[PDB]
Amino acid sequence: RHLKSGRKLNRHSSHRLALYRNQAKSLLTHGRITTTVPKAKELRGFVDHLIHLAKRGDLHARRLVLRDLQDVKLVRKLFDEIAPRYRDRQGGYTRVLKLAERRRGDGAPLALVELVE
Amino acid sequence: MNRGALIKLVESRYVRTDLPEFRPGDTVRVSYKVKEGNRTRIQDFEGIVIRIRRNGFNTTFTVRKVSYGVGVERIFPLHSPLIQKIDIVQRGRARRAKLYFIRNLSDREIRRKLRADRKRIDKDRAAERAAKEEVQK
Amino acid sequence: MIQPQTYLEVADNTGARKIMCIRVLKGSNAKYATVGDVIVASVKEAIPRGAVKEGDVVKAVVVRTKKEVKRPDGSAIRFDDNAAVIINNQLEPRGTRVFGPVARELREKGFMKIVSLAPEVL
Amino acid sequence: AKHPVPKKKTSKARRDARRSHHALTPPILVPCPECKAMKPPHTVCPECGYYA
Amino acid sequence: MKGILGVKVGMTRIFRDDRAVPVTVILAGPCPVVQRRTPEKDGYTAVQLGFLPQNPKRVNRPLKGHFAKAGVEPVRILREIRDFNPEGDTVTVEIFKPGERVDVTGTSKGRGFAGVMKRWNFAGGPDSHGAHKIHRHPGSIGNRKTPGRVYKGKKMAGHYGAERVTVMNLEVVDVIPEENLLLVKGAVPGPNGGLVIVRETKKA
RNA sequence: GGUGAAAAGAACCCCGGGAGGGGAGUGAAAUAGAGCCUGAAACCGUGGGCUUACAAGCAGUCACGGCCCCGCAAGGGGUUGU
RNA sequence: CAGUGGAGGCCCGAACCGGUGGGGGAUGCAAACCCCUCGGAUGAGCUGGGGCUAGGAGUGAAAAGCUAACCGAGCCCGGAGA
RNA sequence: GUGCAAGAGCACUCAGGCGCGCGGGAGAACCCUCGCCAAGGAACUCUGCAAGUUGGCCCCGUAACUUCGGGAGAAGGGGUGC
RNA sequence: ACCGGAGCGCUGUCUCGGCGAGGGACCCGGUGAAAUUGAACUGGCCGUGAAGAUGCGGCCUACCCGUGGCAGGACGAAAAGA
RNA sequence: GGGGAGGUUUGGCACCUCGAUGUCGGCUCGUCGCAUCCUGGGGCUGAAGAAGGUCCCAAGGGUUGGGCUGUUCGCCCAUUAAAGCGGCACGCGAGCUGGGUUCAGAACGUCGUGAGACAGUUCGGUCUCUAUCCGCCACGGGCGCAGGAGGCUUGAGGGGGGCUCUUCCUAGUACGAGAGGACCGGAAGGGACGCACCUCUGGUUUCCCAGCUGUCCCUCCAGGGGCAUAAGCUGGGUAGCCAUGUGCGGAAGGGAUAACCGCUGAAAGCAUCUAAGCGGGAAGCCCGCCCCAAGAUGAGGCCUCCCACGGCGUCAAGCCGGUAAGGACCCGGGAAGACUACCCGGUGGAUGGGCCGGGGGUGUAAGCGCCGCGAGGCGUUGAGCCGACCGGUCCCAAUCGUCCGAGGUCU
Ligand SMILES: [Mg+2]
Ligand SMILES: [Mg+2]
Ligand SMILES: [Mg+2]
Ligand SMILES: [Mg+2]
Ligand SMILES: [Mg+2]
Ligand SMILES: [Mg+2]
Ligand SMILES: [Mg+2]
Ligand SMILES: [Mg+2]
Ligand SMILES: [Mg+2]
Ligand SMILES: [Mg+2]
Ligand SMILES: [Mg+2]
Ligand SMILES: [Mg+2]
Ligand SMILES: [Mg+2]
Ligand SMILES: [Mg+2]
Ligand SMILES: [Mg+2]
Ligand SMILES: [Mg+2]
Ligand SMILES: [Mg+2]
Ligand SMILES: [Mg+2]
Ligand SMILES: [Mg+2]
Ligand SMILES: [Mg+2]
Ligand SMILES: [Mg+2]
Ligand SMILES: [Mg+2]
Ligand SMILES: [Mg+2]
Ligand SMILES: [Mg+2]
Ligand SMILES: [Mg+2]
Ligand SMILES: [Mg+2]
Ligand SMILES: [Mg+2]
Ligand SMILES: [Mg+2]
Ligand SMILES: [Mg+2]
Ligand SMILES: [Mg+2]
Ligand SMILES: [Mg+2]
Ligand SMILES: [Mg+2]
Ligand SMILES: [Mg+2]
Ligand SMILES: [Mg+2]
Ligand SMILES: [Mg+2]
Ligand SMILES: [Mg+2]
Ligand SMILES: [Mg+2]
Ligand SMILES: [Mg+2]
Ligand SMILES: [Mg+2]
Ligand SMILES: [Mg+2]
Ligand SMILES: [Mg+2]
Ligand SMILES: [Mg+2]
Ligand SMILES: [Mg+2]
Ligand SMILES: [Mg+2]
Ligand SMILES: [Mg+2]
Ligand SMILES: [Mg+2]
Ligand SMILES: [Mg+2]
Ligand SMILES: [Mg+2]
Ligand SMILES: [Mg+2]
Ligand SMILES: [Mg+2]
Ligand SMILES: [Mg+2]
Ligand SMILES: [Mg+2]
Ligand SMILES: [Mg+2]
Ligand SMILES: [Mg+2]
Ligand SMILES: [Mg+2]
Ligand SMILES: [Mg+2]
Ligand SMILES: [Mg+2]
Ligand SMILES: [Mg+2]
Ligand SMILES: [Mg+2]
Ligand SMILES: [Mg+2]
Ligand SMILES: [Mg+2]
Ligand SMILES: [Mg+2]
Ligand SMILES: [Mg+2]
Ligand SMILES: [Mg+2]
Ligand SMILES: [Mg+2]
Ligand SMILES: [Mg+2]
Ligand SMILES: [Mg+2]
Ligand SMILES: [Mg+2]
Ligand SMILES: [Mg+2]
Ligand SMILES: [Mg+2]
Ligand SMILES: [Mg+2]
Ligand SMILES: [Mg+2]
Ligand SMILES: [Mg+2]
Ligand SMILES: [Mg+2]
Ligand SMILES: [Mg+2]
Ligand SMILES: [Mg+2]
Ligand SMILES: [Mg+2]
Ligand SMILES: [Mg+2]
Ligand SMILES: [Mg+2]
Ligand SMILES: [Mg+2]
Ligand SMILES: [Mg+2]
Ligand SMILES: [Mg+2]
Ligand SMILES: [Mg+2]
Ligand SMILES: [Mg+2]
Ligand SMILES: [Mg+2]
Ligand SMILES: [Mg+2]
Ligand SMILES: [Mg+2]
Ligand SMILES: [Mg+2]
Ligand SMILES: [Mg+2]
Ligand SMILES: [Mg+2]
Ligand SMILES: [Mg+2]
Ligand SMILES: [Mg+2]
Ligand SMILES: [Mg+2]
Ligand SMILES: [Mg+2]
Ligand SMILES: [Mg+2]
Ligand SMILES: [Mg+2]
Ligand SMILES: [Mg+2]
Ligand SMILES: [Mg+2]
Ligand SMILES: [Mg+2]
Ligand SMILES: [Mg+2]
Ligand SMILES: [Mg+2]
Ligand SMILES: [Mg+2]
Ligand SMILES: [Mg+2]
Ligand SMILES: [Mg+2]
Ligand SMILES: [Mg+2]
Ligand SMILES: [Mg+2]
Ligand SMILES: [Mg+2]
Ligand SMILES: [Mg+2]
Ligand SMILES: [Mg+2]
Ligand SMILES: [Mg+2]
Ligand SMILES: [Mg+2]
Ligand SMILES: [Mg+2]
Ligand SMILES: [Mg+2]
Ligand SMILES: [Mg+2]
Ligand SMILES: [Mg+2]
Ligand SMILES: [Mg+2]
Ligand SMILES: [Mg+2]
Ligand SMILES: [Mg+2]
Ligand SMILES: [Mg+2]
Ligand SMILES: [Mg+2]
Ligand SMILES: [Mg+2]
Ligand SMILES: [Mg+2]
Ligand SMILES: [Mg+2]
Ligand SMILES: [Mg+2]
Ligand SMILES: [Mg+2]
Ligand SMILES: [Mg+2]
Ligand SMILES: [Mg+2]
Ligand SMILES: [Mg+2]
Ligand SMILES: [Mg+2]
Ligand SMILES: [Mg+2]
Ligand SMILES: [Mg+2]
Ligand SMILES: [Mg+2]
Ligand SMILES: [Mg+2]
Ligand SMILES: [Mg+2]
Ligand SMILES: [Mg+2]
Ligand SMILES: [Mg+2]
Ligand SMILES: [Mg+2]
Ligand SMILES: [Mg+2]
Ligand SMILES: [Mg+2]
Ligand SMILES: [Mg+2]
Ligand SMILES: [Mg+2]
Ligand SMILES: [Mg+2]
Ligand SMILES: [Mg+2]
Ligand SMILES: [Mg+2]
Ligand SMILES: [Mg+2]
Ligand SMILES: [Mg+2]
Ligand SMILES: [Mg+2]
Ligand SMILES: [Mg+2]
Ligand SMILES: [Mg+2]
Ligand SMILES: [Mg+2]
Ligand SMILES: [Mg+2]
Ligand SMILES: [Mg+2]
Ligand SMILES: [Mg+2]
Ligand SMILES: [Mg+2]
Ligand SMILES: [Mg+2]
Ligand SMILES: [Mg+2]
Ligand SMILES: [Mg+2]
Ligand SMILES: [Mg+2]
Ligand SMILES: [Mg+2]
Ligand SMILES: [Mg+2]
Ligand SMILES: [Mg+2]
Ligand SMILES: [Mg+2]
Ligand SMILES: [Mg+2]
Ligand SMILES: [Mg+2]
Ligand SMILES: [Mg+2]
Ligand SMILES: [Mg+2]
Ligand SMILES: [Mg+2]
Ligand SMILES: [Mg+2]
Ligand SMILES: [Mg+2]
Ligand SMILES: [Mg+2]
Ligand SMILES: [Mg+2]
Ligand SMILES: [Mg+2]
Ligand SMILES: [Mg+2]
Ligand SMILES: [Mg+2]
Ligand SMILES: [Mg+2]
Ligand SMILES: [Mg+2]
Ligand SMILES: [Mg+2]
Ligand SMILES: [Mg+2]
Ligand SMILES: [Mg+2]
Ligand SMILES: [Mg+2]
Ligand SMILES: [Mg+2]
Ligand SMILES: [Mg+2]
Ligand SMILES: [Mg+2]
Ligand SMILES: [Mg+2]
Ligand SMILES: [Mg+2]
Ligand SMILES: [Mg+2]
Ligand SMILES: [Mg+2]
Ligand SMILES: [Mg+2]
Ligand SMILES: [Mg+2]
Ligand SMILES: [Mg+2]
Ligand SMILES: [Mg+2]
Ligand SMILES: [Mg+2]
Ligand SMILES: [Mg+2]
Ligand SMILES: [Mg+2]
Ligand SMILES: [Mg+2]
Ligand SMILES: [Mg+2]
Ligand SMILES: [Mg+2]
Ligand SMILES: [Mg+2]
Ligand SMILES: [Mg+2]
Ligand SMILES: [Mg+2]
Ligand SMILES: [Mg+2]
Ligand SMILES: [Mg+2]
Ligand SMILES: [Mg+2]
Ligand SMILES: [Mg+2]
Ligand SMILES: [Mg+2]
Ligand SMILES: [Mg+2]
Ligand SMILES: [Mg+2]
Ligand SMILES: [Mg+2]
Ligand SMILES: [Mg+2]
Ligand SMILES: [Mg+2]
Ligand SMILES: [Mg+2]
């Protein structure tokens, strides 16, 4: 039995990685985002990392975060606005609340993701 | 109970402390206690450390050398009761954590590929003689 | 760990350069042989006019392996090659002067002669 | 088709019997504190919302 | 006949004289004897050791009624050690002098639905010369018209692991009463953090 | 291949995006409502009666017993426990 | 002998024409396919368009191969309800 | 277009066009396709089937035999980046 | 890309298997086939019988219904044995 | 010369199957027989001892790897305690293979005027995704267990395991002229197998770190991203899962026996192991060890907890709503898992996620300074990055709630 480990997925590696990124972009562009529950619970931790990494300020951190989100203007918003808002906070920069409506025609459950407040 | 490791870590007291810091890509000389016939000796063993397999206590390291035309490697528990001492002999440029690759290289290439860490030496001999002063006086 | 069909380096002037394992003389069906284990073997090649000729079926004892031997003292040891020393049927070495290192397991096994002529036990 | 195939028509008895565990179960619901209506526990729902 | 409950804390190795020894560390915390099986009341002899401190929360159960008639702090677990009646109080690692040998019991790691090759360590077919759709299959399972059925208990794939596994004659390498610790010869069923009972061997 | 004697083919209101229904209405009849006379059987379903989770079967037959239903009665019908 | 020269059912190798070995596929994506591998690749080469030859007849670098998804004698209708 | 000895090859990419008309999760056995593996190295097997090994260009170098063209990319080596 | 023998190189072919990846398998939502099918309320042994029994006899065993798997039987399916 | 057993061979017969019961060998998985190859126990021996020979008892486990051939068989090599023989459709192709046989192609020898033919030979030649029922491996749902619930258990009945060598002490003693060489008793080390485990050794570790090529892009440099697999390539690699690695097992012991050896002892003045009676005696039998197990409908036992009706049925048992101990739903999860089940936790909380620390991996990040024409180098630097492991911290998320659940029959 696999899984004695710890992690989750679907799709292959290069895709799954691209997934986490393209979500975290939209999420750091809209502040609220709706996806499937599992995709959400996973996106959760990926962002609390760039956000916290954003609390630090040095250009090294900026350059680190660029590796995921390609857009420079987006990292600005992240550093020069999103980040400060989360000063004096330590983790849990993000929140995930499950909705009560399923997606029609495939019956997938949904959940909301949002930059905490 | 919420320290499952630290408990298992308590049994650590079989731990050494005397032994000097050294890292792959530099040669040393361990002195192992051995049972010859029935008595006890102190066989030396001198060669490049090729791997250090870190794991707190019961971490290990392995040295290799050429004895009479053939190569030989030995695995030592770092905190083993049989290592009387371990005189380091020469520091050198690492560039890599595990240097198995010298197995297929035992020749002039080795010497030129693993120069000599003048840095870790300049601190060795410095804090050697420069530190001898404080203890003597 | 040596097994039938395996090649071994010959570490003595018996004349043989290389012998291939035929059968490991441990149990009635042992999987592998190691330092201090004796093996029946064939001489796959030898030097001209040696005591042993190319083609002879000899007995030999493992003096070196590639798979590290694990010692009870918590250490281990492995050599760059697999080697053996051809021995008389009464288990004394056929050749004289033996070259290269040897595992001390050879000692506890009762191969004093060989650890003696050995230029270095390890 | 190729190799295995049923040896006999299943009886309407055995058939329905197989289906003894097919029935559904109603959704678990609770009256949402804010509104009066029903919601699936641990979830937000329209015609309503949340506190902070 | 001794007995004591504990957890597999983990394992490493220590040095006995000039020789390294692999050992498994077992925390056999103090076990408050809870009840007693007797020939008159229960029909056999034994002792119900408790183990591990329970919060009076989960103890909402009338388990408190069992703990009251013994005046014991509520525990998280409790099993009997057959044919062993200690003086009325509490058992501890003290009953295990080094050099003694013990029979350890534990629930093995759960290997889920396991193929015959992992479970029964079968052979399965060839990676190569033909077949290429039975590489890990068990092959034949029977005969022909006679008996014309498969044997009871035939070896076949299925759930395997996470079962009651008892190892025997393990050497008590040490014992640290200052910590209710207990060192053994390493190989003990179950995963770390798993409950595990340790008894007196049947070598002698 | 078949509405009905005749389109009198269902205005209008109601739920529905529609389909399709529910009323109202026509008709001797709408379970003649539009591939609409009659509407058999296999097959699917809803409700009711008797019955079944220690039991061995070409599924029935024979006997006794229990429950349910018919008739004032002796009686008969359904079901099935041994 | 050097130079020039640029021959070939020559050499390597795409297109293109094939179908060597293995694996998959077997109510298939497919009434012959898919993947890796392999053969020829200026010639007895491949190929578009227009034409001709057919039932005991044609065509066949020859397997009784092909002649409209089954050819030791095509398909259809008829003798025929052999 | 760029690179690689060259090329319609290979890799990435313009213009341009598409993600192949069921999705969501889980991370068992088993099957397919793919990657790696201590020591051993054909002991596998009907058979090294399969898979691996070798691989481009430049230079050194190359045997029996021969129909004098061949065998020849024999074999075996060294170089390769900035 | 013929068929046989040997050797060197190399290897999960093998000793002997392990781990990992992806597409299925598995769970949820949508759509939804097939060969087959006397009827079924379809256990084991030892006998027995048209000579290889879930269905006969004797004996043993067995609460009712499913889900994921394996292929010994139903002289399993397919094709009026070539 | 004579009598039998068995149903593995070759036959005889033509009884089921020609609207089909797939033929050899191999592979995989076995299970059974005992007429026993080994190990255990015996009798006799032309048995000094060691070793054999022959018969008896005994399946409990074991019964190797290669060369040749499609082979079964057999020969051979090297070992071994031994390398046992048979049954199961010559076990097993809805499990695999397809080398052999047994279609069409082609050829050799041979026969035939011929077309062709061959228990003669040679090269080639499509083996079918989906299991309904029985059976088997696992895992749930229902109900029952004549109050309801939490936890702990008894073991009827099953299952697993069952092997063997070698050196040493006894002792170079008994035995023998010598060579050789014991019983009994005790010790150590192995082979194969089985269970479990990751400390060590050794693998994998698909994004944990690093380096590298080509190209395209961000943003000119620098720095970085995509693609070159479904990791582009390469060098390493925690946890987890693993064997090549580590631990442990086969017993001991009790009881009853087999062949067999005996005591007492008639029938039968002696004699007899037996007819009354008794002792000894196997790797085998029954226990003992490990695992399952009260659907053991014969539904067991112990500790503890909650108990009256609140309305109709007068008689019969029930029937309808609200509750008690207690359980379930839903949610955060798990070395548990296909699903379900199992286990933990749910704000009185460290369950997951984040953050922090430690462990661990990679092996001196970026930026700047300095040296060099330059590719680079040096320092800041064991830096930077940093999954899974061991912990900490309520930042985020387990919010709020809902449903079921005794009133305990009779002699
Ligand atoms: Mg986890
Ligand atoms: Mg990729
Ligand atoms: Mg992180
Ligand atoms: Mg701790
Ligand atoms: Mg722990
Ligand atoms: Mg295999
Ligand atoms: Mg095939
Ligand atoms: Mg197939
Ligand atoms: Mg049968
Ligand atoms: Mg049967
Ligand atoms: Mg741990
Ligand atoms: Mg009309
Ligand atoms: Mg209307
Ligand atoms: Mg519309
Ligand atoms: Mg309408
Ligand atoms: Mg009406
Ligand atoms: Mg009217
Ligand atoms: Mg009328
Ligand atoms: Mg009407
Ligand atoms: Mg009518
Ligand atoms: Mg009508
Ligand atoms: Mg109609
Ligand atoms: Mg109709
Ligand atoms: Mg009419
Ligand atoms: Mg009808
Ligand atoms: Mg009904
Ligand atoms: Mg009833
Ligand atoms: Mg019945
Ligand atoms: Mg019966
Ligand atoms: Mg009634
Ligand atoms: Mg009446
Ligand atoms: Mg009846
Ligand atoms: Mg010339
Ligand atoms: Mg010229
Ligand atoms: Mg030319
Ligand atoms: Mg020219
Ligand atoms: Mg040509
Ligand atoms: Mg050619
Ligand atoms: Mg062609
Ligand atoms: Mg082909
Ligand atoms: Mg092909
Ligand atoms: Mg061919
Ligand atoms: Mg195939
Ligand atoms: Mg094919
Ligand atoms: Mg197919
Ligand atoms: Mg398909
Ligand atoms: Mg190739
Ligand atoms: Mg080609
Ligand atoms: Mg070519
Ligand atoms: Mg043309
Ligand atoms: Mg034309
Ligand atoms: Mg013409
Ligand atoms: Mg014709
Ligand atoms: Mg032609
Ligand atoms: Mg046609
Ligand atoms: Mg004809
Ligand atoms: Mg006709
Ligand atoms: Mg006719
Ligand atoms: Mg006629
Ligand atoms: Mg290039
Ligand atoms: Mg090129
Ligand atoms: Mg170039
Ligand atoms: Mg287009
Ligand atoms: Mg599609
Ligand atoms: Mg679409
Ligand atoms: Mg690779
Ligand atoms: Mg490789
Ligand atoms: Mg390997
Ligand atoms: Mg390697
Ligand atoms: Mg290797
Ligand atoms: Mg080799
Ligand atoms: Mg071979
Ligand atoms: Mg073989
Ligand atoms: Mg073979
Ligand atoms: Mg052969
Ligand atoms: Mg090949
Ligand atoms: Mg392969
Ligand atoms: Mg490969
Ligand atoms: Mg290569
Ligand atoms: Mg090259
Ligand atoms: Mg390469
Ligand atoms: Mg030529
Ligand atoms: Mg060459
Ligand atoms: Mg050649
Ligand atoms: Mg070359
Ligand atoms: Mg080269
Ligand atoms: Mg470079
Ligand atoms: Mg050819
Ligand atoms: Mg080779
Ligand atoms: Mg390699
Ligand atoms: Mg095999
Ligand atoms: Mg997968
Ligand atoms: Mg599918
Ligand atoms: Mg698909
Ligand atoms: Mg579905
Ligand atoms: Mg049944
Ligand atoms: Mg019988
Ligand atoms: Mg009969
Ligand atoms: Mg009959
Ligand atoms: Mg039958
Ligand atoms: Mg009868
Ligand atoms: Mg019967
Ligand atoms: Mg039964
Ligand atoms: Mg299903
Ligand atoms: Mg299945
Ligand atoms: Mg079957
Ligand atoms: Mg199948
Ligand atoms: Mg069959
Ligand atoms: Mg016929
Ligand atoms: Mg006779
Ligand atoms: Mg017979
Ligand atoms: Mg016969
Ligand atoms: Mg007949
Ligand atoms: Mg007759
Ligand atoms: Mg039939
Ligand atoms: Mg058939
Ligand atoms: Mg066959
Ligand atoms: Mg066969
Ligand atoms: Mg005997
Ligand atoms: Mg004797
Ligand atoms: Mg004698
Ligand atoms: Mg004599
Ligand atoms: Mg004699
Ligand atoms: Mg003797
Ligand atoms: Mg007798
Ligand atoms: Mg016998
Ligand atoms: Mg053999
Ligand atoms: Mg021999
Ligand atoms: Mg022997
Ligand atoms: Mg013998
Ligand atoms: Mg043998
Ligand atoms: Mg026999
Ligand atoms: Mg057999
Ligand atoms: Mg057969
Ligand atoms: Mg037979
Ligand atoms: Mg057969
Ligand atoms: Mg087949
Ligand atoms: Mg076969
Ligand atoms: Mg078949
Ligand atoms: Mg073939
Ligand atoms: Mg074969
Ligand atoms: Mg052949
Ligand atoms: Mg044939
Ligand atoms: Mg034929
Ligand atoms: Mg022919
Ligand atoms: Mg013949
Ligand atoms: Mg042939
Ligand atoms: Mg297939
Ligand atoms: Mg059946
Ligand atoms: Mg059956
Ligand atoms: Mg029992
Ligand atoms: Mg038993
Ligand atoms: Mg048994
Ligand atoms: Mg057994
Ligand atoms: Mg002696
Ligand atoms: Mg002696
Ligand atoms: Mg002596
Ligand atoms: Mg004497
Ligand atoms: Mg004598
Ligand atoms: Mg004497
Ligand atoms: Mg004497
Ligand atoms: Mg004497
Ligand atoms: Mg004398
Ligand atoms: Mg003597
Ligand atoms: Mg002597
Ligand atoms: Mg372990
Ligand atoms: Mg690891
Ligand atoms: Mg990364
Ligand atoms: Mg790592
Ligand atoms: Mg740049
Ligand atoms: Mg790049
Ligand atoms: Mg791609
Ligand atoms: Mg590649
Ligand atoms: Mg690649
Ligand atoms: Mg990359
Ligand atoms: Mg890598
Ligand atoms: Mg005993
Ligand atoms: Mg006893
Ligand atoms: Mg007896
Ligand atoms: Mg007497
Ligand atoms: Mg008697
Ligand atoms: Mg008697
Ligand atoms: Mg006795
Ligand atoms: Mg016994
Ligand atoms: Mg024994
Ligand atoms: Mg007993
Ligand atoms: Mg008993
Ligand atoms: Mg259990
Ligand atoms: Mg139990
Ligand atoms: Mg019960
Ligand atoms: Mg129980
Ligand atoms: Mg009970
Ligand atoms: Mg009680
Ligand atoms: Mg009251
Ligand atoms: Mg009252
Ligand atoms: Mg709550
Ligand atoms: Mg609190
Ligand atoms: Mg937490
Ligand atoms: Mg935490
Ligand atoms: Mg850290
Ligand atoms: Mg470190
Ligand atoms: Mg630096
Ligand atoms: Mg400066
Ligand atoms: Mg400068
Ligand atoms: Mg400058
Ligand atoms: Mg530091
Ligand atoms: Mg990761
Ligand atoms: Mg902390
Ligand atoms: Mg209620
Ligand atoms: Mg109620
Ligand atoms: Mg009641």
UniProtKB/Swiss-Prot annotation, chain A:
One of its GO terms (cellular component) is cytosolic large ribosomal subunit. One of its GO terms (biological process) is translation. GO terms for molecular function: structural constituent of ribosome. InterPro entries: Ribosomal_bL17 (IPR000456), Ribosomal_bL17_sf (IPR036373). It comes from the Bacteria. Keywords: Ribonucleoprotein, Ribosomal protein. HAMAP family: Ribosomal_bL17. Part of the 50S ribosomal subunit. Contacts protein L32. Belongs to the bacterial ribosomal protein bL17 family. This is Large ribosomal subunit protein bL17. The gene is rplQ.
Curated annotation (Swiss-Prot), chain C:
InterPro entries: Ribosomal_uL14, Ribosomal_uL14_bac-type, Ribosomal_uL14_CS, Ribosomal_uL14_sf. Keywords: Ribonucleoprotein, Ribosomal protein, RNA-binding, rRNA-binding. Signal peptide: none annotated. CDD domains: Ribosomal_uL14 (cd00337). It holds the Pfam family Ribosomal_L14. GO terms for biological process: translation. Gene3D superfamilies: Ribosomal protein L14. It comes from the Bacteria. GO terms for cellular component: cytosolic large ribosomal subunit. One of its GO terms (molecular function) is large ribosomal subunit rRNA binding. PANTHER family: 50S/60S RIBOSOMAL PROTEIN L14/L23 (PTHR11761), LARGE RIBOSOMAL SUBUNIT PROTEIN UL14M (PTHR11761:SF3). Binds to 23S rRNA. Forms part of two intersubunit bridges in the 70S ribosome. NCBIfam families: rplN_bact. Belongs to the universal ribosomal protein uL14 family. Part of the 50S ribosomal subunit. Forms a cluster with proteins L3 and L19. In the 70S ribosome, L14 and L19 interact and together make contacts with the 16S rRNA in bridges B5 and B8. This is Large ribosomal subunit protein uL14. It comes from Thermus thermophilus (strain ATCC BAA-163 / DSM 7039 / HB27). The gene is rplN.
UniProtKB/Swiss-Prot annotation, chain D:
SUPFAM superfamilies: Zn-binding ribosomal proteins. Gene3D superfamilies: Single helix bin. One of its GO terms (molecular function) is structural constituent of ribosome. GO terms for biological process: translation. One of its GO terms (cellular component) is large ribosomal subunit. Residues 1-27 are annotated as: Disordered. Keywords: Ribonucleoprotein, Ribosomal protein. Transmembrane segments: none annotated. Residues 1-22 have a biased composition (Basic residues). Part of the 50S ribosomal subunit. Belongs to the bacterial ribosomal protein bL32 family. Found on the solvent side of the large subunit. This is Large ribosomal subunit protein bL32. It comes from Thermus thermophilus (strain ATCC BAA-163 / DSM 7039 / HB27). The lineage of its organism: Bacteria, Thermotogati, Deinococcota, Deinococci, Thermales. The gene is rpmF.
Curated annotation (Swiss-Prot), chain E:
Keywords: Ribonucleoprotein, Ribosomal protein, RNA-binding, rRNA-binding. GO terms for molecular function: rRNA binding; structural constituent of ribosome. Coiled coil: none annotated. Pfam families: Ribosomal_L3 (PF00297). GO terms for biological process: translation. The keyword Kinase does not apply. Gene3D superfamilies: 3.30.160.810, Translation factors (2.40.30.10). One of its GO terms (cellular component) is cytosolic large ribosomal subunit. Part of the 50S ribosomal subunit. Forms a cluster with proteins L14 and L19. Belongs to the universal ribosomal protein uL3 family. One of the primary rRNA binding proteins, it binds directly near the 3'-end of the 23S rRNA, where it nucleates assembly of the 50S subunit. This is Large ribosomal subunit protein uL3. It comes from Thermus thermophilus (strain ATCC BAA-163 / DSM 7039 / HB27). The gene is rplC.
